[PDB]
Write a protein that binds this ligand. Structure first.
Ligand SMILES: Nc1ncnc2c1ncn2[C@@H]1O[C@H](CSCC[C@H](N)C(=O)O)[C@@H](O)[C@H]1O
Lengths: 386, 81, 78, 108, 55, 301, 283
């Protein structure tokens, strides 16, 4: 039924439909104007340490891609309980194709049973995984894999043995059907120790990916580079935003890799091919809130923009100008997503109370009678001589 | 309603007789059901709509319309002259 | 009245249009012409050719064609 | 009231004995969903005045302990039953309060 | 739910009239073996006064 | 580095309460400069907020058209001088300040006791002159607002005095690029660069709402939770979920029929039930066999 | 809270879509600015796809008509200009028309580049009566409304098509104001008419995104003597007269000119430049 496949091409986002789940967060540097930050420090909230999350789940990327006018399908498993049905409904109202979502009545959404060993030190040793970790090879929807022209997945699917096998099967099936494989690293929290075990885990899927997106911190971690720059210093020196030469990324390259995207948030995006390499500057002075400080929406928007631009013109993956345009578009998408999330969540003052930016930037009247800004009774005046 | 008024007069030999008949019908409407008129429903507009509807042409009753976009009670539209 | 007079005052013609003796866009429909005017592609009084798909209803001087271009294949332009 | 307890304090509490369900909050100061979960757990602790115990462990200060607990991200809650026979529940993401109430009232 | 659940005259016949200010309300022209006829295309509800059918 | 750059090509401080700045922005594609210029001009002239004194309270005055013995200016002149004080603040609310001095001498803008969130732009601005040692206590009211408005003070909150822009052809018509210049005049409460940045941010905040979700899209911070509460409520007093909240994704359908329905803007079960067989027949790749199998599938539900 | 909603939508045909949108509550003066910016964006900042050039193969002899084709070449170009397309293409692609013979040639008979679609396949192009193969080579571009004409291909006798990139046929905005005393509120209405290559909701979102992208770059950061006259000065007559010939009368103007321009004026030498500095140093 190839004549029913419309435009834009369908994108399959394989993984988990988590709700506000952050894999990890690393210290980061962003382009910023510090005269403004000094002047606006009483009205604009900033983190004491700038730490940026690489992104979120595959469901978040599917939702973000749909918001850009692209066609996105989410392939995963959800439980039939209230939380799983709520997540499925939320994915449905975001124009994400959920026909590839498997509903399991024997599983609990976002809950796993852990057998804690109480003899030595504390280990958890997961026994029964959650609903979005039990997608079997037989539950993979192959119709959506035939229709889709790009396959998206993250490293969170490689943490469980059975889910890793399912991910490998889905990647191989998609490659057989002539799809472009997009690997979004988004390195999980436990994988930031023992680089060698991370390489052992991700080496098989790394060689099956046509496009790979990693952060600057992830690229440094995988290349064995120690962070030489300074963090949380009020300047924008070029050493914080360095475009590594292709020889630095040479060890990570393989035969079927087309593009490698190295993102530093929405401040800067670096692209690498066999013939071309370059970077595009962006903007990261977006409204930030204690509820939105991890900057995961920016990463989701960047990845969604990259996927959109690569899918709409798949024959220009080696064109340098189109790669520059794609990087700029991804920067813009991340900026817009971060702005929207900041507006939606609001500032801290289901028990969840939030105040708007207008209320956050509202000060006290300073009408305390003891205060020096009120007409006290004439008994106590304290005039100052001219 | 201006188009309807012109249409109703295409079948009237004398317009003064038309006005008198409309006024008499409106007076009957008000006498029979006093409380239904004077606010959002006007008797003369009701007579005109009924006379248009009697020809088989559908019209809202008494040409009574409101603004769906009023931002709650108490807010009055400020006309832009 | 002044607005209508300026609106319906047509092209500059003759010596007021060209400096020298001469020895314009074609629009499928009026909406295309108005859209081109909105995008500053043409002026309010710049001449243009509009395809007409109704009967001849343009007020003009009752005059024979200036020039008839008759082709040997049968088509002629008046 | 949620109290910040180190890894060794949590070891002492687990290896000890308690008559009330224990909820351990794995969080970091750089995560907004962690603050939203903190508000949710504050309301929950208001709901359960003394019949439950809610504690918070900072992941950045206890990264090795968090890795030993198979904490794959944030926010993460651990529901420890007072009975040693039953197993602990690990919840990933910003789950609603009703899920916590159901867990405590059904499998705790 | 919606998913679970004499010939018409030549359209040009009324169209040539319609373009010349002929209006037929609530009726349609139908042609049969006997000849042309005018039939109510819907339910002509009774009003207080006479209803306009054709002009 | 950037292909499109902006820079301040001139900055000038004519006085303490008149700043000037000219900015450039090139290269722009044809037509972009006009849009940027008009939107930026309207934002600078209408959307930038300022902080002003709005209410001053006296104690021994019959009416604002009277004099004070020993003060050279009448109450009206004092109020007019107070209306000309330029303040700066990033916060909202009705802050209050104090003027409490003893003469003789000059009462300048540096004699105002401001709350920590409000600052004086020009210390030398004149309020009144005391000729003899009299008492003078004035209570002020200060707030940040847009546009313009105990004696009330007619406060004009607009801090941008004037704006201008110009558009110039970049050069050869490769893409008929353009050069944009922007001139800004402020009263010193914020620099022209700050005005430019604030105008850009205000315009973005004005255009960003259209990129949210349309009104009445999610069931009513975290849109997921109210629907979860609805599901919890439905779990008691079992009545199942409405067809409007059930989508055709969870109905087992052949992929061709799913795509045909999706391209016809059919998303939920209520839309599928309210559809007619004839309309679905009017869609291609949807034969009578498809109609009967879809009816059978729906009957199975 | 500030929210938006679509209050009306229609599809009269496949190349005529209508939509009406709302935005409220707004403060005084905001609705007009938003409407003006949105109308400009809708009318000229949205990208459209059109046939911009046509090449006629099969040796048409470069005449006004082709044997066997009912429509003339100019008529064919006019028909081609009316075809509504949508795409995401970057750069310029090529499309081809190659119909065997007699019948009607419509938009459906166009072989398209990968990203290009056709809004209406029933749009007429040409009518063929005799069994003659017609081959037309179409050039397809994607540009903004406020854009212009690119580099012209003067070669190979290809007839241009004066395409107007206006996917949004028309746009309007209106303001409704309400208030009860000191507090006021206004509502923005936006009407969008599109040619079917885009929905009015898509046009609204694209216009908003284009405006935001136009105002992002302003937030970018980067990586790190009038009354002392010449006559009162004791100057040599040669230097004094040269200054007047170059219209210099006051010491302020003398200091306004660099030493480069002083030598340029006629009858001025290096010795005079040194002499000027010494006298100024002595006063
Ligand atoms: N009630 C009736 N029964 C049978 N024929 C009728 C009739 N009323 C009218 N007619 C016929 O219709 C003609 C009037 S013109 C009416 C329309 C005509 N039947 C046609 O098709 O053109 C008369 O010649 C008469 O013969």
């Amino acid at each position: 039924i190839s004549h029913t496949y419309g435009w834009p091409p369908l994108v399959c986002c394989f993984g988990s439909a988590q709700h506000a789940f952050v894999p990890s967060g690393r210290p980061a540097n962003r382009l910023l104007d510090y005269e403004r930050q000094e002047r606006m420090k009483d009205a604009v909230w900033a983190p004491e340490k700038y730490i940026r999350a690489p992104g979120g789940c595959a469901g978040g990327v599917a939702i973000a891609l749909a918001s850009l006018g692209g066609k996105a399908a989410f392939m995963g498993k959800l439980g039939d309980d209230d939380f799983g049905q709520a997540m499925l409904y939320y994915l449905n109202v975001c124009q994400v194709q959920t026909r590839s979502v498997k509903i399991d009545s024997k599983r609990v959404t976002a809950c796993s049973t852990m057998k804690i060993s109480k003899r030595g030190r504390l280990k958890s040793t997961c026994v029964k995984p959650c609903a979005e970790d039990s997608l079997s090879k037989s539950e993979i929807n192959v119709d959506v894999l035939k229709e889709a022209k790009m396959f998206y997945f993250t490293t969170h699917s490689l943490l469980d043995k059975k889910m890793m096998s399912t991910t490998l099967q889905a990647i191989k099936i998609s490659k057989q059907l002539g799809n472009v494989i997009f690997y979004d690293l988004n390195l999980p929290l436990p994988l930031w120790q023992s680089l060698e075990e991370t390489k052992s885990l991700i080496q098989e899927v790394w060689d099956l990916a046509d496009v790979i997106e990693v952060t600057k911190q992830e690229l440094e971690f995988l290349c064995g580079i120690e962070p030489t720059e300074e963090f949380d210093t009020k300047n924008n020196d070029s050493s914080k935003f360095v475009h590594y030469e292709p020889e630095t990324v040479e060890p990570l390259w393989h035969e079927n890799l087309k593009i490698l995207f190295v993102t530093n948030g929405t401040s800067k995006i670096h692209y690498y091919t066999k013939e071309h390499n370059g970077a595009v500057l962006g903007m990261e002075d977006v409204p930030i809130t204690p509820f939105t400080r991890d900057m995961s929406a920016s990463g989701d928007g960047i990845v969604a923009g990259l996927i959109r631009m690569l899918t709409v013109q798949p024959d220009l993956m080696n064109d340098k100008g189109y790669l520059e345009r794609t990087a700029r578009y991804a920067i813009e998408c991340g900026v817009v997503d971060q702005w929207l999330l900041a507006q939606t969540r609001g500032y801290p003052p289901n028990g969840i109370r939030s105040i708007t930016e207008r209320e956050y930037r509202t000060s006290k009247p300073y009408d305390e009678p003891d205060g020096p800004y009120v007409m006290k009774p004439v008994e106590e005046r304290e005039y100052r001589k001219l | 309603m201006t188009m309807d008024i012109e249409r109703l007069l295409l079948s009237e030999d004398n317009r003064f007789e038309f006005v008198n008949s409309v006024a008499a019908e409106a007076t009957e409407y008000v006498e029979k059901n006093r409380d239904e008129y004077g606010g959002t429903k006007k008797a003369i507009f009701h007579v005109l709509s009924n006379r248009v509807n009697d020809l088989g042409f559908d019209r809202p009753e008494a040409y009574a319309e409101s603004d769906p976009y009023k931002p709650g009670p108490g807010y009055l539209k400020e006309y832009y002259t | 009245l002044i607005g209508l007079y300026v609106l319906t005052s047509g092209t500059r013609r003759g010596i007021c249009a060209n400096r020298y003796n001469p020895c314009e866009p074609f629009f499928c429909n009026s909406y295309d012409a108005i859209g081109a005017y909105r995008q500053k592609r043409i002026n309010l009084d710049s001449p243009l050719w509009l395809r007409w798909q109704l009967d001849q209803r343009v007020i003009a001087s009752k005059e024979v064609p200036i020039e008839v271009h008759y082709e040997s294949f049968g088509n002629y332009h008046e | 009231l949620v109290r910040k307890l180190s890894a060794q304090e949590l070891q002492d509490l687990v290896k000890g004995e308690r008559k009330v369900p224990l909820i351990v909050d794995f969080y970091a100061t750089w995560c907004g969903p962690c603050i939203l979960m903190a508000q949710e757990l504050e309301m929950l602790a208001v709901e359960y005045e003394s019949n439950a115990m809610i504690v918070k462990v900072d992941t950045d200060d206890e990264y090795e302990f968090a890795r030993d607990m198979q904490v794959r991200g944030l926010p993460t809650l651990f529901f420890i039953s007072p009975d040693p026979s039953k197993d602990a529940i690990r919840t990933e993401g910003l789950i609603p309060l009703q899920m916590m109430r159901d867990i405590i009232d059904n499998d705790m | 739910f919606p998913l679970f659940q004499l010939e018409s005259a030549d359209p040009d016949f009324y169209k040539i009239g319609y373009v010349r200010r002929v209006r037929a309300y609530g009726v349609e022209f139908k042609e049969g073996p006997d000849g042309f006829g005018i039939y109510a295309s819907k339910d002509i509800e009774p009003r207080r006064r006479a209803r306009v059918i054709m002009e | 580095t950037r292909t499109l750059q902006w820079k301040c090509v001139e900055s000038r401080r004519d006085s303490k309460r008149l700043y000037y700045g000219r900015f450039i922005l090139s290269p722009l594609m044809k037509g972009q400069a006009d849009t940027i210029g008009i939107a930026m001009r309207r934002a600078l002239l209408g959307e930038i907020e300022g902080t002003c004194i709005t209410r001053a309270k006296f104690e021994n005055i019959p009416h604002d058209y009277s004099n004070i013995v020993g003060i050279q200016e009448s109450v009206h002149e004092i109020l007019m001088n107070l209306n000309e004080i330029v303040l700066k603040s990033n916060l909202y609310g009705t802050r209050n300040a104090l003027i409490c001095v003893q003469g003789p001498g000059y009462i300048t803008a540096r004699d105002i006791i401001l709350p920590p969130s409000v600052e004086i732009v020009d210390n030398t601005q004149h309020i009144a002159t005391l000729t003899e040692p009299i008492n003078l206590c004035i209570g002020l009211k200060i707030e940040r607002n847009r546009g313009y408005s105990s004696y009330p003070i007619d406060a004009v909150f607009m801090p941008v005095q004037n704006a201008n822009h110009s558009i110039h052809s970049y050069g050869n018509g490769n893409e008929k690029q353009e050069i944009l210049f922007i001139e800004i005049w402020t009263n010193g409460s914020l620099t022209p660069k700050e005005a430019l940045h604030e105008a850009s941010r205000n315009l973005i905040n004005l255009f960003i709402p259209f990129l949210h979700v349309e009104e009445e899209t999610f069931y009513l911070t975290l849109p997921l939770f109210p629907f979860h509460n609805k599901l919890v409520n439905l779990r008691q007093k079992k009545k199942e979920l409405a067809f409007q909240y059930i989508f055709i994704d969870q109905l087992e359908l052949p992929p061709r029929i799913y795509n045909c329905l999706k391209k016809s803007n059919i998303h939920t079960l209520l839309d599928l039930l309210n559809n007619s067989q004839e309309d679905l027949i009017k869609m291609e790749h949807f034969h009578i066999e498809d109609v009967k199998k879809l009816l059978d599938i729906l009957e199975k539900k």
